[PDB]
């Protein structure tokens, strides 16, 4: 199955985000950090190891997808390259984001970050950096990601995902 | 517990937990610190298809509490749900050093 951006009608004051990665503990911590605060909207977080998802009918529509990659592991990079082939091209227009973990400790790194830079540039999407094991750093990334989610869902007038594409575009 | 979060892949997690519990039992594991395997098997993967001789390898496992590190690999996502029997058969076979042929 191929995931589609506008398959279902939106809910009332609701935003949904999907996190795809191999490390489950990091995903759980990130979801908790996102949900701890209070906001005007209603938030829902879905956790998955890879795509395609198991089939279900009650799934609400997905507004934003974040691919988190561990720089200390080749397995995570291979998993994300495999997952990237099951989402339709229409869904990359301002609704996909890449998150890279572990650049703080360079000695542990198995992946040269030229690789993730080139991957993000190839798929026309932003690339973010955060060390998710540190709670203080994770807290601010959760809020930035919540704001991006609110923009994508249509909860800020005058700004849409396609507009967000030009704001976050890199010069080279 | 925080019903806003939805855990997909839940059935896979419960299945791997059940398999690990069945394979490694529920008793406290006896404390070892080392295990050695000697391999004399053929490479089977275009690559070295014409070769007819075994590939000679020797590998060792070392841990402060072995059989406790191994038990936690599959839930953490580093191994598949059933481990190979060579790793889960230490106390039952009363074996610590192994030799494997094709």
């Amino acid at each position: 199955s191929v995931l589609r951006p506008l398959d279902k009608l939106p809910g009332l004051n609701t935003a949904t985000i999907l996190l795809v990665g191999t490390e489950d503990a990091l995903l759980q911590q990130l979801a908790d950090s996102m949900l701890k605060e209070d906001c005007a909207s209603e938030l829902k977080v879905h956790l998955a190891k890879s795509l395609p998802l198991p089939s279900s009918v009650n799934r609400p529509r997905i507004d934003l997808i974040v691919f988190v990659v561990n720089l200390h592991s080749k397995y995570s990079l291979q998993n994300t390259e495999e997952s990237l082939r099951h989402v339709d091209a229409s869904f990359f227009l301002g609704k996909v984001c890449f998150l890279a973990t572990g650049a703080g400790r360079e000695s542990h790194c198995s992946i040269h970050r030229h690789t993730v830079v080139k991957l993000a540039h190839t798929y026309q999407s932003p690339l973010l950096y955060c060390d998710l094991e540190v709670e203080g750093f994770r807290a601010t990334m959760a809020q930035r990601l919540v704001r991006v989610l609110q923009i994508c869902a249509g909860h800020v007038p005058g700004v849409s995902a396609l507009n967000l594409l030009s704001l976050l575009r890199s010069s080279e | 517990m925080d019903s806003r979060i939805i855990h997909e892949n839940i059935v896979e997690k419960e299945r791997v937990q059940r398999i690990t519990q069945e394979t490694f039992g529920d008793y406290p594991q006896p404390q070892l610190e080392f295990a050695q395997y000697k391999l004399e098997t053929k490479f089977k993967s275009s690559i070295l298809a014409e070769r007819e001789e075994p590939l000679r390898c020797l590998i060792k496992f070392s841990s402060p509490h072995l059989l406790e590190a191994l038990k936690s690999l599959a839930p953490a996502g580093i191994a598949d749900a059933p481990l190979s029997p060579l790793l889960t058969c230490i106390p039952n076979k009363r074996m610590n050093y192994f030799k494997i042929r094709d």
């Binding site: 809910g11 004051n13 009650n58 | 059933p82 094709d102």
Partner: peptide, 29 residues
């Protein structure tokens, strides 16, 4: 048909809620 609740029903709900293979390796070696 889990009764797709009418918008009106869902809306009031939210408003109100603001208070809460083990034989194949032993055969190869």
């Amino acid at each position: 048909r889990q009764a797709k609740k009418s918008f009106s029903t869902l809306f009031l709900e939210t408003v109100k809620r603001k208070s809460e293979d083990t034989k194949l390796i032993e055969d190869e070696f």
